Subunit: 273 residues, 3 copies
């Protein structure tokens, strides 16, 4: 990927204001800010500046300052050290689609970096301590991966080809990057196997501490080690219609009107069933 979660915000919300850095500036912050005018935060004002808190640590201090009461969550301030943070619009994590009001931890950001993710839906909650890791080669005399560094150009060839041919897909090789649907909840200390999973269905619930080794159907609940299907969120009737209506792609338009539907499943289907 190429661009910063902050810069996507600044490109959309800065609106000719100065960036006000609230916190100790880092190397890659200073770079992400070089297209803009910035200075260390002193006295701030939503009319004059965009406050950028470097770390979540720095954000708590700003919010606890009386000057923060006029700044709206994303239109006026942001936390630099939070590439998995949620936004009110569709965004990129490296080059990975992430829908509105979707969030994930650094473990998922790295999976976005390693090309493990094809896409992440809308209104999806992935806890920070979740993880997405692929497998190493299991059909070889060795299991290590950093022995590669000792390989020369010749040995590298014969090694990379067997990885491409392996149908178990070590390092998610020769497969499709996995997809995460919308309205998905993922517990903590969880594991989705990038070497065997290609699709988390929309609405799929992944319990805490669950290790998910196969694709999860939409609106399924999975817990345990390994993950088993404990229940389904909704009767199948809802499931087919929910795939049809796709509430998660509604604009803020249809969300506030149909709040009574989105809140009572019973009310949702008496109108859309």
């Amino acid at each position: 990927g190429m661009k910063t979660r902050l810069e996507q915000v600044l490109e959309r919300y800065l609106n000719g204001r100065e960036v006000a850095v609230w916190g100790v500036p880092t190397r890659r912050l200073l770079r992400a800010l070089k297209p803009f005018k910035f200075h260390t935060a002193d006295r701030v004002d939503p009319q004059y500046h965009y406050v950028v808190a470097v770390t979540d640590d720095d954000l708590t201090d700003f919010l606890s300052d009386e000057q923060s009461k006029s700044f709206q969550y994303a239109n006026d301030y942001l936390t630099f050290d939070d590439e998995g943070g949620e936004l009110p619009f569709e965004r990129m994590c490296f080059n990975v689609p992430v829908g509105r009001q979707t969030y994930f931890g650094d473990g998922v950001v790295g999976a976005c970096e390693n090309g493990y993710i094809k896409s992440i839906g809308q209104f999806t909650s992935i806890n920070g301590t979740a993880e997405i890791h692929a497998n190493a080669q299991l059909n070889m005399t060795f299991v290590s991966d950093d022995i590669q560094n000792f390989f020369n150009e010749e040995s590298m060839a014969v090694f990379q080809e067997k990885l491409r041919k392996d149908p178990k897909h070590p390092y998610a090789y020769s497969k499709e990057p996995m997809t995460i649907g919308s309205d998905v909840y993922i517990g903590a200390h969880a594991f989705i196997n990038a070497s065997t999973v290609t699709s988390i269905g929309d609405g799929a619930i992944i319990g805490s501490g669950a290790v998910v080794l196969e694709n999860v159907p939409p609106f399924a609940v999975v817990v345990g080690v390994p993950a088993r299907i404990k229940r389904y969120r909704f009767s199948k009737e809802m499931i087919e219609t929910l795939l049809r209506v796709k509430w998660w792609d509604w604009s803020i338009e249809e969300i506030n009107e149909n709040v009574d539907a989105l809140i009572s499943p019973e009310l949702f289907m008496k109108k859309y069933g």
Copy 2:
């Protein structure tokens, strides 16, 4: 909550010395220190200064410096970036009671912030990678929580009321904040469900990687996914008397005298049974 773990220490142990910052100062450190006199650490002396190490990283460097051999653990130095660290006196984590020589990771500090915790006992060890998270709404068409941000004032009402009425207590709503007793041990990669747990009994042991979904009785051992009662630490005789004596509330007074009792359970009951 309102106040800093460091400031509670400085209010009690500074004793008219200067704070000596050992490390790169952060935004919220600089604020926590504005009631006091401070300067970047150069040459230090327990008579002259209170050394404040910013991060646990910065603490290791100070202890490894020859100037640190005269500073006692809490009376003379402290690590700013350790709100879950243990103290020799009863303290607050935000507005949460935390007894003496009790510690926990940032996951528990956030639960203290989210109001999930009512209290934490004395001499309780909670590993850093432990976690306390509540559940989202399960009786709604959606499971997401940050869709809220898209709600207006009108849709917000009808949404918040159903949360208050939900007996499953999403986000620990309309329940009592959970309590953690004294002499409690909690393994790592563990989970206590703030949406269904209200009391960890005194002495309760929570094995590593265990997901705890219901209240744990005092002095019970729980492991597995989900957590089951593997054994009890003590015969019930000890349990009733341990609730009566409550050694964990002894001053340092009765601790050093009754060390032979506190060390041999057999000796503990021949004196208190």
Copy 3:
């Protein structure tokens, strides 16, 4: 332990160049660099400088800079905040042997600090969120460990002796520090019990989220809570010969030649069986 992963590299690869710090300097970096000449990175050149990125965050920014394309992974740059990072040569983590192209997270670095580790083999991959923790005392009225701080010199004696006598080895007391063989893979959110484990066999695979309570035989696969032996990587024939040949101690010499053997187990034994 005594010395820095960076300093072991600088002592071997600096070769009369200047250290160029890429990132905000920390207290313990500034100390690790005091034997050398250094300055904040401006324009860099592998001939003139050794680039030191402070944090993994700072490393990503350097690699993404056009000046980084001439710097080789370890000979020319390094990440200070990565004591578990892999190296092309045998190294120390505190005073713990760590072989070539071996890596582990901070959880394992702390175990190296707590003296829990005797050694770590070659070409071994331990994920960052892995952990190695010992147990507290289970034969005492209390389970807490920081009550110790309240003990005086007298009560300390009678407490420390019972720890030394405990055959369950709380805090890995009176046992041998555990050993991790070569070609070992360890999943994330995993647990090796320093209070009951003394040897992870060479080639042993530890699945994600697995809690390992007993020694693991060489080339065994363990998953589940608690860990059970799911399968063996190789037929026993390979296992005995793999212990004999010990490919992991080959120089880069025998690695690139025998790549066809190291890649096809079938080819490995037709030559070494």
